[model samples]
Target chain A: VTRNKIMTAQYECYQKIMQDPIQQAEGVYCNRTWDGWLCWNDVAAGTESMQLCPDYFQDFDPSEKVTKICDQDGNWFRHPASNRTWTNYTQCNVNTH
Target chain B: GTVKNYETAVQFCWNHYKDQMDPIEKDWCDWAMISRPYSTLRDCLEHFAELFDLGFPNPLAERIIFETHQIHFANCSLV
Candidate 1:
C-alpha cells in the first residue's frame, strides 16, 4: 500500500541521516539535511541536497521528490522569476481536503 | 504497547519544548496523526529522535529519546 511505502521511505531516510556523519559547515551556516527536509543553524551560506517530500497527508501521495543545490558560491538554486530558492514541495497543501 | 510508547515519545517532545515549539505543534500534530500506527515503532521513535535533535536540548530528554529508541530497536522492530 502507498501508506506503508511512504512510512518505509521516511524511516529509511531517517536511518540514512542517523548513520552518516553530520556535514560540516562553512561561514556562519551549519546546515544539514534530514529525513524530510533540510535544516540549518539559523544562518548559513547555503546547501546542496536531496530528499523526499514531507508526507503531510495520509490519504494523498507525496509531492515530487526534490533536490536543493547550494552552489559552490554559497547560494541555493533558485527560480529566475521568483528569485528565491525553491524546495520543490509545493504539493503539501492542507486546504484541499 | 508500542503505540503507547510512540505516544509517550511524542508527549516527551511536547512537554519539553511546548514553550519554544516553532511553526506550531498543530502542523506536526496533524502529520503525526496522519502517520499514526507508524510503519515500525523504530520509525516512530526515530521521528522523536529527530524532533529532539531539532531543538530540545535537555539531557534528560535526550536520555529518554535514546533509551526509547533502544527499546524499540530491541523489541519493537516490527511494530
Candidate 2:
C-alpha cells in the first residue's frame, strides 16, 4: 500500500507539471518545474538552485546535489550544445565509487 | 467515484484528515489551501516531503499528496 500510494503521487505529480502553462510567472525569475526526475522551484535570475538528489536508482547518490540555473535573462540555462533546459544531475552519482 | 466541487474541495479535503496532530500533515492541508488557483506544484512538494520525514504515516502521506494534487491542480486546470 505504501508503494502504491507513492507511485500514485508520482503519477499525479507528473501530470500536474505536464499540464502547466508556459507563461509561468510575471517576473524576472525562472518558473518552478519538474526536470523529469526532480522538481525545482522558481529561482531569481542569475541564481543557482540546489537540492539533494533523489534515491530513485542505485546509481543516484541521494546525498549529492541536483542543480538548476536561472540565467540573467530570467530564462533557464541550457547546455551550450543542446537547446533543452539543463539540470546538473551528474553530481548525484559521484559517491558510487 | 463521487467527488466534491471546487467550493468544497479544500475544506472537504482537510476536514476528512482533521485531528492529525503532526506538524507535517497539518502543514499539507494549509499548503493546499494556499496553493490553489496559483497552481504551483513545487511549493507544496517540499512541504509534502516533510510528511515523510516523521510521524505522518508514509502511505497516507503519499495518498493525500496524490489526492490533494488532483483537486487543486488537475481539477483546477480544468474548464
Candidate 3:
C-alpha cells in the first residue's frame, strides 16, 4: 500500500517483462547500466522507453512555465510561452500529454 | 471548385481593395481568419488566411497559429 512498495513492485514487474522470451526473440531485452537502474528499448524496432534512465529527466526543469487551456472533454492543453500563440502548436502541444 | 476562378476572384478583390489593405491599419492588427464568437475583426483575421484555398492545403494559412493562440488570452477583439 505504500508508495515505495508499489514503485518497487512495478520496477520488478518491468524487469520480468523485459526478460520475457518474446522480448529476447524480438530483441526488446533490458540493459543494466553502470548505475543501479535498468534500461530498455527495442533494438530492432528502433523504439525506446527512456523512463528507466535514472537521470532520464535531468535536463528538465520542474519550474518551467507554461500556459494551459481546458477543453470541453476535460483535456488540459499545456503550451510553452513561445507556443502560447497559434504557431507553436507542434512544439508545445506535443508535450502537453 | 475551379482553381482558376478562385484565383481570379482573389486577385480581383485585392486589386479593388489595395488602399484598404493596410496591414497596420486599425482594420488589420492580428485577425483570426476563423470566425470565433469571442473574436474581433482583427483577431479573427489573425486566424483567417487565404494563402491556400478552402481545402487540404489550408494548414499553412496559420503558419504561426501556435504562437498566435496566446493572443486570445489578451481578450482584445470584437463580437
Candidate 4:
C-alpha cells in the first residue's frame, strides 16, 4: 500500500515537473522522479540533490541521506557498473549517527 | 573501472598545473585521495559515510569535502 501510494505520488511529481517553469526552461535539468525508495525532486543540471533516506526498509536509517545526480547533460546519472539509474543510499544504514 | 585510480592521476595533474595548489585545491587533491575511493557515486556516498562514522582520519579535509563534494563532483573534470 505504501509503495503504491508513493508510486502514484511520483507520477504526480513527474507531471508537476513537466509543467514547471524551471523544467520548461532551455537550461538543463533532471526531471523529478521516484527512485523506488524515495521521492527525488527535479534539479538543475550538473548538481547532486540530497534528502534523508527513507526508513521503509529495516536496514535504512531515516536520518541518513540519499543523493541523486543530475548530470551535465540534463539526464539522471546512471551507475557505471550497472548502466542503470542509481541513487546513493549507502549512508542509510552504515553511516547512521 | 579505473575511476578509483583516476583520483591519483588528477592529484598529480593538480600538482603539476600549479606549483602551489592552494588549500581548496590541495584539499581536493586529498579529498580525492582518501575521502572518495569508489568507481560509482553510490559507492562513494556509502564509503564517505563510513569515513566519519568510525572515527575519520582528518577533520579539515572532511570540512572542505563537506562543503563542495556535490559541487565538485558535478563538474569533476574541471576540478
**Predicted model with the maximum DockQ:** 1
Worst 10 residues of 2 chain A by lDDT: A1-10
Higher-ranked by TM-score: 1 or 2: 2
Best by lDDT: 2
Clash total of candidate 2: 0
| Residue A89, candidate 3: alpha-carbon lDDT | 20
Query: How much is B43 displaced in model 1, in angstroms?
Result: 11
Angstrom error of the Cα, residue B9, model 2: value is: 36
The segments of candidate 3 whose C-alpha lies over 4 angstroms from its true place after superposition are A1-88, B1-4, B19-79
Tens digits of per-residue lDDT for model 4 on B1-79? 3224434433333333233333355354343442322122223333443543422212332333233333333333222
lDDT of each: 0.43, 0.53, 0.29, 0.50
Residues A7-78 of candidate 1 have per-residue lDDT tens digits of: 555443433334343556345432333323333222244554655455545543455454566655555555
Task: Kindly indicate the candidate among 2 and 3 with the higher DockQ.
Answer: 2
Error of 2 at B68 (Å): 16
TM-score of each prediction: 0.34, 0.46, 0.18, 0.45
Q: Residue A60: error of model 4 in Å? A: 1.3
What DockQ does every candidate get? 0.12, 0.04, 0.01, 0.01
The sequence of per-residue lDDT tens digits that candidate 2 reaches over residues B19-62 is: 33223443443434433322323223333435333222233333
Instruction: Return whichever of 2 and 3 wins on lDDT.
Output: 2
Model 1: colliding residue pairs: A29-A44, A47-A70
State candidate 4's DockQ. 0.01
Kindly provide the TM-score of model 2 when superposed on the true structure, using C-alpha atoms: 0.46
Cα-based lDDT at residue A65, candidate 2: 81
Query: What does candidate 3's lDDT look like per residue over A1-97, in tens digits?
Result: 2333322332333333333324336332222211112222223332222332122243433333222233333322224542321111221232443
How would you order the candidates by DockQ, starting with the best? 1, 2, 4, 3
